Amino acid sequence: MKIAIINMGNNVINFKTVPSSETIYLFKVISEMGLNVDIISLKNGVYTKSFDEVDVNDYDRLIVVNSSINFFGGKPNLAILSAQKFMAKYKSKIYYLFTDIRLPFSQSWPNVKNRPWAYLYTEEELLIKSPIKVISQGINLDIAKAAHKKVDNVIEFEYFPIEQYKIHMNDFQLSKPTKKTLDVIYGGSFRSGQRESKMVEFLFDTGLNIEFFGNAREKQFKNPKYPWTKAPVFTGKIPMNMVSEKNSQAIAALIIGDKNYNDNFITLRVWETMASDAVMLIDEEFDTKHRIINDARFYVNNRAELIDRVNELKHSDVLRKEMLSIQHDILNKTRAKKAEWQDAFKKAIDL
Ligand SMILES: O=c1ccn([C@@H]2O[C@H](COP(=O)(O)OP(=O)(O)O)[C@@H](O)[C@H]2O)c(=O)[nH]1
Ligand SMILES: [Mn+2]
């Protein structure tokens, strides 16, 4: 049994970029559950083999991490092209890890054919015909199915909480008590404005000391429908393996998601936040049935409620520590099901 994992549209090297980091974490968690796996990327490296040094058919399973296949600017993105060429040569079923609703599987050919550099690729080299099984992080599968309507080879849809890998890593540990320097914190990208309303609601004009880390920038928030006066402090990106430490600098950390994540996706940030020294505060709309934690104190409906909840936490260190103790206990209950999680993953990739 030999497994190959690749990122469909981003180079994989180290932990400097999110797509590279997530691919390496997945490689590591799969290796830790008893499996011979290789990451195949553009070049040979600490964690990877090169597309041109291996034969895709030497592998029995091909796992693909979702990614955008948009060609920005006027140049051939080799990370996208080489990955799809690799996929096109594979004979067996391809397992597509769907962790972001904006990144469903799709063919790059339709786009490539109309580029000025189209002469560099043939339809045969890029058109992927192998059957595809979408492994969705969404438990309802409704979004995954709708997102993959324009694809015919996708013959299967199965749910699996992929991003729980954060807590199942062999080197994982809960964050320790940290000196507080912020009231509220949130880390992430602008996500092409797909979450602007929620970001403005909970992180702007709060009167609190809030930090927004990640690729997002203040100048990106300009939608007239979601006005604001005072923005949080944007500090820039940091490595994915430093996120829990960053979250721990605040009294509370926010959990929000795209509309379609609601009552469906339990994202990586849920675990990165729950494991941190910051109290996890969740937008009620994101998890209306309170599947993450059965304690309403961890949920807020709007800006006003967030402010009040944070004020309560700043006023009582006892309450803050009580809530942290509860969320850490809940996280431990899921960690206790590691073996079941691993077996479920193996079942998902037909092992
Ligand atoms: O500076 C940063 C900010 C965020 N992240 C990662 O980016 C994820 C958030 O991704 P996104 O902004 O797409 O939000 P999601 O839709 O996953 O909530 C976090 O969970 C972190 O793992 C990171 O590595 N560095
Ligand atoms: Mn995500």
Side-chain angles (χ1 to χ4, degrees):
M1 177 51 72
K2 190 56 184 294
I3 302 177
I5 182 167
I6 67 180
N7 184 286
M8 193 168 79
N10 302 85
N11 193 13
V12 179
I13 304 175
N14 51 48
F15 297 96
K16 288 185 176 182
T17 67
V18 174
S20 178
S21 295
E22 56 188 358
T23 307
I24 299 172
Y25 268 89
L26 286 166
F27 155 77
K28 285 176 168 293
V29 81
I30 293 175
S31 300
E32 291 175 2
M33 64 175 83
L35 294 175
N36 188 183
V37 53
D38 294 327
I39 297 183
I40 313 301
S41 191
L42 297 179
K43 297 176 179 175
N44 197 75
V46 173
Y47 305 106
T48 67
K49 285 188 177 298
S50 180
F51 287 119
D52 294 64
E53 75 167 301
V54 306
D55 188 318
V56 67
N57 291 305
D58 282 357
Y59 299 99
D60 306 295
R61 295 292 186 291
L62 177 59
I63 302 176
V64 180
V65 178
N66 62 183
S67 176
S68 167
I69 58 174
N70 291 170
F71 293 107
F72 301 120
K75 297 184 64 177
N77 182 319
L78 294 182
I80 293 172
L81 295 162
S82 297
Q84 295 227 153
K85 275 183 57 182
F86 196 68
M87 294 171 71
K89 297 177 183 177
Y90 195 59
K91 318 172 191 176
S92 302
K93 190 164 61 180
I94 299 174
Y95 302 86
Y96 194 75
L97 304 181
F98 190 58
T99 63
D100 186 330
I101 59 175
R102 303 182 69 274
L103 315 175
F105 169 74
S106 57
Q107 304 280 177
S108 65
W109 181 243
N111 307 299
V112 177
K113 59 187 289 294
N114 308 330
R115 289 297 77 198
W117 42 269
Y119 61 93
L120 294 173
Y121 297 84
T122 65
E123 186 187 314
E124 188 177 305
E125 298 182 311
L126 294 174
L127 196 57
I128 299 165
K129 302 185 302 299
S130 278
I132 306 304
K133 175 178 182 177
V134 175
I135 294 176
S136 177
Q137 175 143 293
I139 193 169
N140 295 305
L141 296 182
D142 43 56
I143 304 303
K145 295 173 178 177
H148 296 75
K149 268 297 181 60
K150 293 186 177 182
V151 299
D152 298 301
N153 41 301
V154 174
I155 63 176
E156 300 179 301
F157 289 99
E158 164 157 40
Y159 158 71
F160 180 72
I162 297 170
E163 301 194 318
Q164 256 186 48
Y165 66 70
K166 170 69 178 178
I167 70 179
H168 300 305
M169 306 305 314
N170 280 169
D171 70 334
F172 171 91
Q173 69 187 312
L174 291 169
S175 295
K176 278 56 180 177
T178 305
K179 186 178 188 302
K180 303 303 183 185
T181 63
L182 298 167
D183 289 328
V184 182
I185 192 169
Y186 172 93
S189 72
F190 184 61
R191 292 189 60 71
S192 304
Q194 288 298 297
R195 198 176 295 177
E196 191 168 353
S197 182
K198 291 290 181 177
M199 294 174 164
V200 173
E201 176 81 20
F202 297 111
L203 308 167
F204 289 62
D205 293 306
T206 66
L208 303 174
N209 183 12
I210 301 188
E211 180 177 319
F212 193 140
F213 65 103
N215 300 323
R217 304 185 306 298
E218 185 188 303
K219 55 181 172 298
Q220 300 184 90
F221 297 77
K222 55 183 179 182
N223 194 319
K225 300 180 180 180
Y226 315 119
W228 53 271
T229 303
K230 265 60 185 305
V233 179
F234 289 80
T235 55
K237 70 181 298 183
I238 62 173
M240 180 181 156
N241 57 12
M242 288 295 290
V243 171
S244 286
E245 277 80 0
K246 178 94 297 184
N247 284 334
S248 299
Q249 299 190 190
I251 289 175
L254 177 75
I255 292 182
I256 47 173
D258 280 23
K259 179 68 174 182
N260 283 167
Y261 280 169
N262 300 347
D263 303 326
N264 189 28
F265 281 54
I266 287 179
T267 55
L268 176 61
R269 75 170 58 259
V270 172
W271 302 117
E272 301 175 316
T273 301
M274 193 185 303
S276 83
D277 191 54
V279 175
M280 167 181 58
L281 293 188
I282 310 159
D283 170 10
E284 177 70 26
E285 183 167 46
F286 180 79
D287 181 31
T288 67
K289 304 296 183 177
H290 294 185
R291 301 299 185 187
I292 297 169
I293 188 162
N294 186 33
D295 187 316
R297 293 178 297 172
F298 296 84
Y299 297 80
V300 294
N301 289 96
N302 60 10
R303 181 181 290 172
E305 289 199 344
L306 175 58
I307 297 302
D308 177 59
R309 198 58 49 70
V310 174
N311 284 332
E312 295 181 59
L313 294 171
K314 298 192 66 173
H315 178 76
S316 177
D317 188 61
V318 172
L319 169 68
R320 188 182 66 76
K321 289 178 177 180
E322 180 204 356
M323 289 184 70
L324 279 175
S325 182
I326 296 299
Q327 78 183 45
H328 286 347
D329 176 66
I330 292 302
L331 188 153
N332 286 165
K333 281 181 170 56
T334 296
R335 290 190 68 201
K337 300 182 294 182
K338 184 178 186 179
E340 299 178 0
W341 182 80
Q342 296 174 309
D343 295 320
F345 181 67
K346 292 180 181 177
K347 179 182 177 184
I349 57 176
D350 305 309
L351 272 56

